[model samples]
Every structure is written in C-alpha cells, then in structure tokens.
Target chain A: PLIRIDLTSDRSREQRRAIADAVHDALVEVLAIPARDRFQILTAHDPSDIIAEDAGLGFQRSPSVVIIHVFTQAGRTIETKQRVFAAITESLAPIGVAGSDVFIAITENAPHDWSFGFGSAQYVTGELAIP
Target chain B: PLIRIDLTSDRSREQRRAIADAVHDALVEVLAIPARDRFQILTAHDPSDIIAEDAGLGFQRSPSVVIIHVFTQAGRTIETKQRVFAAITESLAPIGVAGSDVFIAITENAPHDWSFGFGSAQYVTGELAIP
Candidate 1:
C-alpha cells in the first residue's frame, strides 16, 4: 500500500512535521487504519522526488514543487480518494501550498505472504530458526 | 517484477512455483518485456503484501481487490494497456485467478541521472584516476 502525497511549499520543518502529523492523524482517525499495519511514511527534503514535468523531468531551477511518498495499506475507494484529496488540499492551503501543485498517487498492496520471523525453519519445522 | 500472490486454498509448493514460472514466462512471452532488464522474480509464502483496503472514510474489509502494480516501463499507450491487460487476464485465468479482482495500476518512475558503482574519483576527474 503506497500513498504518495506531494505538495509544493516553502514551509519550515516544523510546518512540514505538523502536516505529517495531521496526515497521520487523518489516516488513523478518519480512515481507521490500524497502527500496527501502517507502513512507514517518508518525506523528501528536496521536493525533487515528487515534482516532475509531463515527461518525468524534474525542474532544476524552479522553487515550486514538492514530492512525498506514502506507502500504506490499499483499502481505498474512489470516494475515499476524493475525501483524502480534499483533506490534503485544505491542510496545505495555509502554508503556501496550492492544489494545483499537489499530486497524490496511491499504490495498493495484497497481504498474504508476509512474515516477520527470522530464519528458514520457523514456519516449516515449527522451531524458531535463526540464520 | 513484484507480484505478491496469496491463495488460501491448499496448493502444493510445485503449484506455487509453477505460478511464478508462468508469470515470468508471461511477462516476457506475452507482454514483450525485454529479458535483459526485468526484475528478479519473487514469491511470497503467503501473499502478505497487496490485499486489504477500504478503511479510509469508507471500508476496510474483504478480499475483493487483488492489487497489482505494473511499474512499467510507464509511457504505456491506452491501446498498449488494453493489449497487455487482456494478455495477463487470459494468461492468469488458467491458473485460477479472476480478471475482475486483478487491479492494475501504473506507477511512472522519473528517470533522473542514476549512476552505478565507484568511489569518488572518476566523477571528479577526466584522468580516469583511481582513488
């Protein structure tokens, strides 16, 4: 599950962190995603990772783009998309972030073959094998 | 190259292996992806990543969505999309997956200057010097 939220802004770290917190809260409160399953959310300090031209070209000289990637569970729908989009747009509006400069992309994942165990025999031989 | 599969029904490991083998075979055989640069094939014990969605302002339940990311080579045409789409749908159906739940999304990766290997010498020198 990957949800990438990019916003073009000149805000300070404190501001960005606030936004991140808001986003996280929205995920937990509005979206109801369990804290246990939520994937790590990363922020790009350079903004180059998120903003690019139509041909996938990053603006070298422009100070008007930002990119963020959020990889999380894929339990979203079209309606959910609209709600999140609006929430983000509103959240960033006060910090010189424009809706025109924000781009959100979502990547959904399937959960069936994941394990957090160590070694080659934990599930096989029923022993906590370490390698 | 990352298609995580998870079937609850009891299937032999050979059957699972065959699924991956068929998938790789289809990527090259059907989609016409170059063999020179495709990702390594990976299988999950269980499909631990790529299923489960709908808790953000709506639903957070069910196995109705089979998530798949075609992190292509992403300048794909719509016609190109339909062709590959049909090909994968037909190719996977024989192995007991449905076309309706197979959700395919395109992730466009921007090609910036990516480099491989080395110390910090050649980049700063035309002398072909070694550090």
Candidate 2:
C-alpha cells in the first residue's frame, strides 16, 4: 500500500527539490515511517498535460504538473493520509506549487505482487507466478 | 501501491502452470501474506491485444487483458482490499479466467518518488533518490 502524491508544478529545480525534501521529512517525522520502510516518491514533468473544462467553460490549460507516486505498506490509515497531505501542501506552498495543481493518486499493493531472486529464475514460483 | 494485473491468453504448453498455481494458493491461503512481506505479480501479453466498450462495446471488444503491477506498503485496507481483491478475482477465476477481464494496476511507491535506481540503477540512492 503506497500513498502516491503527484504534484504538477511550474516551479524551478530548486522548488522541486524543496518539495521532495519536505515530503521526505514529513513521511519520516510525522508518519513515524521507519527510515527503512519509508515511502518512495517519483516526480514526472508534464508541461503540456491537459485539464478538461466543464461545459466547455474553463477551457483547456497546459499547466506544468508534477506527478508524485508514493508506495508504502498495506493497511495504511486515514490519519496517515492527513499527515502526508498536510506536509505536502505546507511544503509546496512557498514554492508556488498550488494545492489544486497537485494531483495525488495513492495506490496499495498486496503481498502477492512482487518478485526478487535470480535472473529468469527470479520470477519463478510465486503468486501469479510467471515462468 | 497499485495492483496492476496483466495476464495474456493463448494458454499452451502448460495451462500457464495451472494459472500460476491457483494464484499461489489464494495468496497464501486467503492472504495472511508475510512470507517476507509478500505480493508482486507481473505478466504481459498481446496476441493482438485490445478490449473495447459495452453499448456495442461488448460487440467491439477483445477479452485478454492481464496487466498486474502491484507496488505496496501504503494505506491499503478494506480488509486489505478485501484480501487483495479477493486474491485477484479469485486467482484468475480458474484457467478459463472468466470474471471481468483480469486487469489490476496497483501502483503505490512513494518517498519523494524514485531515483537512483535506474530504469537506470546500480547508480544512485536516497528518497525518490535520483541524482
């Protein structure tokens, strides 16, 4: 279970770094996430991603967006989300990364979803095992 | 984390080894999962892959979609997503694999996102951790 927080922004490199740092800190400090089992984040730059308007009202806008993907352990609580969200918002505010522009997509993973071993042998013998 | 489930048709040679051995025996027999913190299923295929809509959708459709990518360690609940979505739609509803086009995408890996490890790895480190 990972809490993916994707923030799309038109900020500078420094700003991005700051956001990431803030997020990292929040996860560690607030969530009590072990330094070892802390969540992982990834940022993607989409300069021309479209945002559709309702009833053709707002019109399409090409906003610079940062897509964040967070992955953590299963059975995460709502309280956890509150902490992460707060940290992200507070962190990104000074950098001009807006809450509206920040889109978060959190996903959860089950136990039977990964593999790690030898080469082709690695993927062998497991849930949904592909040999 | 997101649970992405991808399964390809054309079951030959060995019935895909009894559907990945009944989905690793219903995710360790109804998901107590923690054989070293379980879960990782990846499979890909497309013997001419494509599946369309309903209202004339079912008519213009292709049924053979198995895309599973589950990255967990987040806030995954619902009785752990009903025990990993019922052990993945009951581990592919028996080799016949009926029940709703086996397609799950669980992507939850956060921590400032993901760097260092390549698409490019053996190279960097730290949260999202890309240098």
Candidate 3:
C-alpha cells in the first residue's frame, strides 16, 4: 500500500508528476495493484540531501537516479519481484528517467502492520481484500 | 545508513528539524554509527495523502503515526533490531511523538547495494567500513 519514490533532481513539478504516474502504472501492471489503491510519495531533493551511488558495480547513473522503496504485504516470489523491477525500469524509460538511473529496493511486511487512516485493520477485518 | 521517516502533519520546519535530529541521535546511540554518517528523509503529508490504519489487533494510534523505513546492511539479529526499536521510540517521546504512533519496518540489503556517492564500493574496496 506504500510506494515511495525519491530522486535527487532539480526537475520541475510537472516532470515529477509524470514520474509518479509512470511508477504507479508499473505497480498496477506488474504487481496487479488496484488502480485506486495508490499511495505514493515522490520527493525531489537538492543534491546534498541525496547520496545515492552505485557500489562500484559500474552502474553509472545520473543525478536523475530514482530510488524506489516498496513496502508491501509479504509472500511474493523471486519471479514476482524480478518482474516489478523490470517493469519499473521500462516504465521510467519513456519518462526519460534512465534505466541505470533507476534503483529499487522492495520491503515486505505483514498486513497487520499497516493502518490505512481508520484505527482498524481493513485487511484483517475483511473490509479490504488482500492484494 | 539511510533512514526514511514519513508522517501526516503540516508541522513547522523547526519541528521537522528537531525530529530529524532526534532520529539521527537514536541511530548513533543504538546502532553505534559514526557521528558524521547520516541520511534521512522526513516528509509530512496531508491527512488524505496518509492512509495508515491499525490492522485491527487494536493498536491504538494517533494521527501522528510514524512510518520508519531504515535501509542498512544485512546480518543484524533480532535482539539488535529490538534494541533499535526501543531506542527510536524513546528518542521520539520528548518530541510529542507517541510510541503507539510509531510503526517501524527495517530493510537490510548487502553493502554492495549502497553507493554514498563516488560510484565506488566503499565496503568491498576498503573505502567505507561496513556497519
């Protein structure tokens, strides 16, 4: 339910919005997330606030490097994750955010840990269907 | 070495500064991190943008719910993680952030996954020591 994207870019707001839309589309396509179940945070930071570099693996990325942090319900397979990464890179390519500039790290946790505004569990309580 | 904390509030910049300082201090004290190494992102959202609800085990939470996403090197034990949780909760107390409002999810990846600029493997190449 949480998709947070951060980039150390001095890009314009319209450009950032386009990036966010592309990211959300990837999640919907690969992860099968409901289009309405969108929760994303896109932050454009000044260069000093961001320190993303390839760990010498030769992933030469620009300041446009986008860090994708996905916090979702656990139990997805390795294949499912691989698809997400690939889809994200493909999605961002058309937006002009390079594949090399895209770095993703997915974090999976139990549904019990999430609280979607109400003080109750929509998933556990049978209000929200598990994705 | 990266901490991303997100909450829903239109808090003053000064309040955010204090929150960031407290978070960094907790990392230094519990994680025994070097004083100079710090990277954190705190984004306050409008209530509509934040959809955090307790997953029905009845964990009462305020609107000040904090989602702490810590990205670091793998290999920490359960005890080490618990200690970090306790320290962070305690650190936020004086800032008016309640323990119940804190929701932490720790993400650990290999040292090769990080690049704190310079496009080099600091840990593998002996430039930056592993945590």
Top model by DockQ, which number?
Answer: 3
- lDDT by residue (A1-131, candidate 3, tens digit) is 59878886687788788888987898899878788888988878655444454544454657665777777887666556666667777777877777666666666678887778769977788777886
Per-prediction TM-score: 0.38, 0.38, 0.58
Report lDDT (Cα) of residue A2, candidate 1: 42
Candidate 3 residue-wise lDDT, B25-81, digit = tens: 887898887765665666677757766778887777777677788888788899989
DockQ per candidate, 2 decimals: 0.03, 0.04, 0.10
Candidates sorted on DockQ, descending: 3, 2, 1
Candidate number achieving the greatest TM-score relative to the actual structure: 3
Quick one: how many clashes does candidate 3 have? 9
Residue-by-residue lDDT tens digits, candidate 1, B6-114:
3322446665565555555666765565554344333332232223332221324333333344554344455455554455555656775555434343444322211
Which of 2 and 3 is the better model by DockQ? 3
Show where candidate 2 strays beyond 4 Å: A1-10, A36-41, A50-62, A110-131, B1-131
lDDT of 2 at B34: 28
Question: Where's the lowest-lDDT run of ten residues in candidate 1 chain A?
Answer: A113-122
Question: Cα RMSD to native, each candidate?
Answer: 15.8, 16.2, 7.7
